[PDB]
Design an enzyme around this catalytic site. Structure first.
Site, PDB file in Angstrom:
ATOM      1  N   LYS A 154       7.895  13.579  -0.303  1.00  0.00           N
ATOM      2  CA  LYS A 154       8.069  12.848   0.946  1.00  0.00           C
ATOM      3  C   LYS A 154       7.024  13.320   1.959  1.00  0.00           C
ATOM      4  O   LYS A 154       6.609  12.573   2.817  1.00  0.00           O
ATOM      5  CB  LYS A 154       9.457  13.068   1.581  1.00  0.00           C
ATOM      6  CG  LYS A 154      10.557  12.208   1.067  1.00  0.00           C
ATOM      7  CD  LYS A 154      11.717  12.123   2.083  1.00  0.00           C
ATOM      8  CE  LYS A 154      12.600  13.376   2.119  1.00  0.00           C
ATOM      9  NZ  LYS A 154      13.713  13.298   3.116  1.00  0.00           N
ATOM     10  N   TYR A 209      10.380  18.632   6.813  1.00  0.00           N
ATOM     11  CA  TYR A 209       9.489  19.523   6.023  1.00  0.00           C
ATOM     12  C   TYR A 209       8.471  20.235   6.923  1.00  0.00           C
ATOM     13  O   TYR A 209       8.115  21.379   6.654  1.00  0.00           O
ATOM     14  CB  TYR A 209       8.719  18.746   4.931  1.00  0.00           C
ATOM     15  CG  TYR A 209       9.544  18.153   3.816  1.00  0.00           C
ATOM     16  CD1 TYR A 209      10.882  18.498   3.629  1.00  0.00           C
ATOM     17  CD2 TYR A 209       8.978  17.268   2.929  1.00  0.00           C
ATOM     18  CE1 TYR A 209      11.637  17.958   2.577  1.00  0.00           C
ATOM     19  CE2 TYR A 209       9.699  16.760   1.847  1.00  0.00           C
ATOM     20  CZ  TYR A 209      11.022  17.113   1.671  1.00  0.00           C
ATOM     21  OH  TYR A 209      11.741  16.565   0.649  1.00  0.00           O
TER      22      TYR A 209
HETATM   23  N1  LIG Z   1      16.725  15.862  -5.755  1.00  0.00           N
HETATM   24  C1  LIG Z   1      15.442  15.424  -5.857  1.00  0.00           C
HETATM   25  O1  LIG Z   1      15.071  14.567  -6.721  1.00  0.00           O
HETATM   26  C2  LIG Z   1      14.393  15.987  -4.967  1.00  0.00           C
HETATM   27  C3  LIG Z   1      13.050  15.632  -5.248  1.00  0.00           C
HETATM   28  C4  LIG Z   1      12.011  16.128  -4.503  1.00  0.00           C
HETATM   29  C5  LIG Z   1      12.306  17.011  -3.482  1.00  0.00           C
HETATM   30  N2  LIG Z   1      13.578  17.360  -3.219  1.00  0.00           N
HETATM   31  C6  LIG Z   1      13.799  18.252  -2.079  1.00  0.00           C
HETATM   32  O2  LIG Z   1      14.344  19.517  -2.486  1.00  0.00           O
HETATM   33  C7  LIG Z   1      15.003  20.068  -1.357  1.00  0.00           C
HETATM   34  C8  LIG Z   1      16.362  20.571  -1.854  1.00  0.00           C
HETATM   35  O3  LIG Z   1      17.031  19.415  -2.277  1.00  0.00           O
HETATM   36  P1  LIG Z   1      17.861  19.256  -3.627  1.00  0.00           P
HETATM   37  O4  LIG Z   1      17.775  17.814  -4.029  1.00  0.00           O
HETATM   38  O5  LIG Z   1      17.370  20.401  -4.556  1.00  0.00           O
HETATM   39  O6  LIG Z   1      19.328  19.443  -2.952  1.00  0.00           O
HETATM   40  P2  LIG Z   1      20.756  19.205  -3.640  1.00  0.00           P
HETATM   41  O7  LIG Z   1      21.437  18.079  -2.913  1.00  0.00           O
HETATM   42  O8  LIG Z   1      20.653  19.038  -5.167  1.00  0.00           O
HETATM   43  O9  LIG Z   1      21.426  20.658  -3.322  1.00  0.00           O
HETATM   44  C9  LIG Z   1      21.797  20.986  -1.981  1.00  0.00           C
HETATM   45  C10 LIG Z   1      22.296  22.408  -1.981  1.00  0.00           C
HETATM   46  O10 LIG Z   1      22.271  22.903  -0.632  1.00  0.00           O
HETATM   47  C11 LIG Z   1      23.597  23.331  -0.301  1.00  0.00           C
HETATM   48  N3  LIG Z   1      23.901  23.090   1.127  1.00  0.00           N
HETATM   49  C12 LIG Z   1      23.835  21.940   1.850  1.00  0.00           C
HETATM   50  N4  LIG Z   1      24.246  22.158   3.131  1.00  0.00           N
HETATM   51  C13 LIG Z   1      24.556  23.468   3.229  1.00  0.00           C
HETATM   52  C14 LIG Z   1      25.053  24.389   4.265  1.00  0.00           C
HETATM   53  N5  LIG Z   1      25.313  23.996   5.525  1.00  0.00           N
HETATM   54  N6  LIG Z   1      25.257  25.674   3.904  1.00  0.00           N
HETATM   55  C15 LIG Z   1      25.016  26.115   2.639  1.00  0.00           C
HETATM   56  N7  LIG Z   1      24.570  25.346   1.640  1.00  0.00           N
HETATM   57  C16 LIG Z   1      24.320  24.056   1.895  1.00  0.00           C
HETATM   58  C17 LIG Z   1      24.522  22.528  -1.170  1.00  0.00           C
HETATM   59  O11 LIG Z   1      25.822  23.089  -1.309  1.00  0.00           O
HETATM   60  C18 LIG Z   1      23.734  22.478  -2.473  1.00  0.00           C
HETATM   61  O12 LIG Z   1      23.879  23.635  -3.296  1.00  0.00           O
HETATM   62  C19 LIG Z   1      15.079  18.933  -0.302  1.00  0.00           C
HETATM   63  O13 LIG Z   1      14.058  19.008   0.686  1.00  0.00           O
HETATM   64  C20 LIG Z   1      14.824  17.664  -1.097  1.00  0.00           C
HETATM   65  O14 LIG Z   1      14.321  16.552  -0.340  1.00  0.00           O
HETATM   66  C21 LIG Z   1      14.624  16.854  -3.917  1.00  0.00           C
HETATM   67  C1  LIG Z   2      12.338   8.030  -4.132  1.00  0.00           C
HETATM   68  C2  LIG Z   2      11.366   8.488  -5.179  1.00  0.00           C
HETATM   69  C3  LIG Z   2      11.095   7.567  -6.352  1.00  0.00           C
HETATM   70  O1  LIG Z   2      10.343   7.913  -7.228  1.00  0.00           O
HETATM   71  C4  LIG Z   2      10.709   9.825  -5.118  1.00  0.00           C
HETATM   72  C5  LIG Z   2      11.022  10.797  -3.992  1.00  0.00           C
HETATM   73  C6  LIG Z   2      11.767  11.981  -4.626  1.00  0.00           C
HETATM   74  C7  LIG Z   2      12.088  13.083  -3.602  1.00  0.00           C
HETATM   75  C8  LIG Z   2      13.514  13.551  -3.506  1.00  0.00           C
HETATM   76  C9  LIG Z   2      11.070  13.454  -2.526  1.00  0.00           C
HETATM   77  C10 LIG Z   2      11.305  14.547  -1.565  1.00  0.00           C
HETATM   78  O2  LIG Z   2      10.387  14.858  -0.815  1.00  0.00           O
END
Ligand SMILES: NC(=O)c1ccc[n+]([C@@H]2O[C@H](COP(=O)([O-])OP(=O)(O)OC[C@H]3O[C@@H](n4cnc5c(N)ncnc54)[C@H](O)[C@@H]3O)[C@@H](O)[C@H]2O)c1
Ligand SMILES: C/C(C=O)=C\CC/C(C)=C/C=O
Ligand SMILES: NC(=O)c1ccc[n+]([C@@H]2O[C@H](COP(=O)([O-])OP(=O)(O)OC[C@H]3O[C@@H](n4cnc5c(N)ncnc54)[C@H](O)[C@@H]3O)[C@@H](O)[C@H]2O)c1
Ligand SMILES: C/C(C=O)=C\CC/C(C)=C/C=O
Lengths: 361, 361
Positions: free
Chosen positions: A121, A149
């Site tokens: 993102k 971020y």
């Molecule tokens: N899931 C994806 O496909 C993806 C892809 C790219 C980037 N990301 C990024 O990775 C980062 C982490 O996201 P994720 O998808 O790994 O998250 P997730 O939703 O899989 O996990 C969130 C975790 O944070 C904890 N959490 C949330 N609020 C909390 C609080 N107040 N206190 C304590 N713990 C708390 C939750 O309990 C959980 O363990 C984010 O910036 C997200 O945008 C995610």
């Molecule tokens: C929505 C998408 C589709 O491929 C990709 C974005 C995945 C994530 C969670 C980005 C975080 O920065």
């Protein structure tokens, strides 16, 4: 025991947090043997209590609670921040991360490194309301958007610089992973959709855009993100770098769609020329009960539909295109981990069946 | 000397042949130290006479000539067939390859392996007058077209099976390379175009399609193709496999176009919305003399325009899309060579300047 390294995994129930909890405990893992503290919001779910992680329930947005729960953790060597609050609020996300650092940095005298996980993102914008062109490389400058971020990076750079800690930022692609507690788990989401299609004797009908069906896409396996974070945390060549993380290849949703159908033994309906995207979130509006029935029928780990699936996020994946990221920098630094994305997808499916989050077949 | 391995490089003046001639002579090269016989059609050009390769001029479409020139080469251990006749004729291409094998197999008692280089055309068709969808994987079945690659593979499988030799087929992507004697050298071609734009005080104007400007594309560095061929020739895990070969990443022609302009210190004109592809072959019709002037002015290695450039091939590159190939199989087999395609492109430029095929700047 005494341990070589002590990890604080903030977001241990997450899609990447949950992989780190497995990966950090393997005997071949760099920096090992590892002790693992795992922080998350809710009480330890059952599946995680059967893992060798010291689980700490803590609202990390609450500063006093966070101090009282993490101040005593003096042995910490490496922080893996793999969490977010579940909305795009710059302030509340920033508070989470600041609380972690303010609680640990002054109390953990052998602290070495802080790993921050954000995402691609960074390159194209936020989910509410421009993009850089791809392939995305790490040197691309910030977009002029309130992306939380940016705040997390600024906090990271400040706190590590003034305290002689090393840092890394990881910007994973879309994650292929297994946790049912994630707010953004594309594979569980599509698995739940297919499970419902099957239970209601319907076909696996593709609801997305034409472009998303046909364009090149990429992703990362959760285990590979964990290896990449661990690598940057211990390998001195990797220190103080921003780094993308993807499986190293590309796929198309159309080919994934076919494999998904095959994995659930049901018929597929692909993208239909001229037809347009419908919202899977809208189609699955009031299926909470069908899901509660399915969970009970198959004796699954109980999950609410809105927990295990994120249909809104699938809708975004299915109107997206042009989001490929480059792994050249990581490879030029020596990280050569990769996965076959088609196999990684299948392996997430298998593992969610293995752990009983979704029905066997 | 005695050598560990003896290579017959058929097509040594080619875009990949010429890299193998360098790569096989490096001291770290697997299977080394290597003796190298190099076959090509024309008399040894000057640049190649300054290399430690035993050059054999031979028309390999002439069976008797080929027997008389290659029968005596008893020490050969590995054949690298990196040639074609310069048209899509199944029969004349097949004759070339058959002549090589019929001349060498019965005379080289320590022959072990035959490496055949074809290409990603296998997946989408021929240049005269359907495609598989991508990313292309090696298991995709043959298209129903008279592709000379099918004949070469059939000959390879027959001859190696009945003679207990190992084989490999390599299907490179578009090659980024340095030879001025190639019939399909995209980088020299674009380098020549830019050199002419510069000499005639014009901008580097993009003549291609919208799609080719904006779509994801991939390529391979000639040196990486040589490493990949050498790897399959000596590593027993790689034996008897069909294998794609690309740099492991993706790029866009638009970003390459900008770098090309910068490398030649001239202004760029990108793709213009709504405007359509023009033929660069047609635009460069009668520039042979301008090129002969440029060669003399800068004291370049003398080349005819039609030799060093293949404007027709650039036109095809610039109406192409959806041709990405997968490197997963090679990676799963252990080959982890890669290149940063933007850097590989620049490095071809530098090297063609270094070897004096194109003007310095
Ligand atoms: N899931 C994806 O496909 C993806 C892809 C790219 C980037 N990301 C990024 O990775 C980062 C982490 O996201 P994720 O998808 O790994 O998250 P997730 O939703 O899989 O996990 C969130 C975790 O944070 C904890 N959490 C949330 N609020 C909390 C609080 N107040 N206190 C304590 N713990 C708390 C939750 O309990 C959980 O363990 C984010 O910036 C997200 O945008 C995610
Ligand atoms: C929505 C998408 C589709 O491929 C990709 C974005 C995945 C994530 C969670 C980005 C975080 O920065
Ligand atoms: N150039 C590319 O970008 C590219 C990309 C993918 C695949 N390929 C494939 O690689 C294979 C080899 O092509 P290339 O591009 O490396 O070729 P090239 O044009 O760079 O080299 C051709 C070589 O074969 C020799 N040759 C031609 N006719 C001959 C004859 N009668 N006797 C002896 N030598 C002869 C030439 O002298 C020369 O050394 C082809 O199947 C081609 O389609 C090429
Ligand atoms: C024309 C093009 C554009 O990317 C790729 C084909 C490259 C080659 C020479 C294929 C041979 O099989």
């Amino acid at each position: 025991k005494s341990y070589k390294s002590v990890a604080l995994v903030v977001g241990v129930t997450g899609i990447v947090g949950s992989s780190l909890a497995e990966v950090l405990k393997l005997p071949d893992t760099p920096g090992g043997p590892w002790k693992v503290y795992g922080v998350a919001r809710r009480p330890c779910p059952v599946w995680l209590a059967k893992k060798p992680v010291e689980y700490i329930q803590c609202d990390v947005s609450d500063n006093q609670e966070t101090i009282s729960k993490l101040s005593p953790l003096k042995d910490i060597t490496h922080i893996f921040y793999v969490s977010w609050i579940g909305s795009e609020d710059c302030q509340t996300n920033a508070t989470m991360f600041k609380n972690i650092l303010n609680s640990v940095i002054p109390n953990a005298s052998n602290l070495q490194h802080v790993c921050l996980q954000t995402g691609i993102k960074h390159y194209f914008g936020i989910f509410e309301e421009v993009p850089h062109d791809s392939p995305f490389t790490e040197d691309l400058p910030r977009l002029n958007v309130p992306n939380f971020y940016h705040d997390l990076e600024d906090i990271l750079y400040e706190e590590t610089g003034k305290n002689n800690l090393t840092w890394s930022v990881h910007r994973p692609a879309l994650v292929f992973g297994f946790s049912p507690c994630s707010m953004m788990n594309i594979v569980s989401t599509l698995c739940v959709y297919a499970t419902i299609c099957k239970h209601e004797n319907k076909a696996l009908v593709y609801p997305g855009s034409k472009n998303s069906w046909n364009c090149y896409a990429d992703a990362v396996d959760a285990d590979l993100v964990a290896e990449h974070e661990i690598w940057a945390a211990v390998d001195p060549k990797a220190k103080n770098q921003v780094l993308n993380c993807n499986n190293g290849d590309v796929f198309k949703w159309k080919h994934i769609w076919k494999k998904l159908a095959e994995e659930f033994g049901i018929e597929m309906v692909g993208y239909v020329e001229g037809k347009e995207q419908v919202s899977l979130a809208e189609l699955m509006k009031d299926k909470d009960q069908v899901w509660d029935e399915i969970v009970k029928k198959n004796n699954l780990v109980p999950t609410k539909l809105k927990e295990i699936a994120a249909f809104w996020f699938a809708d975004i994946a299915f109107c997206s295109e042009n989001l490929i990221s480059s792994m050249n920098k990581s490879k030029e630094l020596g990280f050569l981990g990769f996965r076959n994305s088609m196999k990684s997808f299948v392996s997430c499916i298998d593992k969610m069946r293995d752990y009983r989050f979704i029905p066997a077949s």
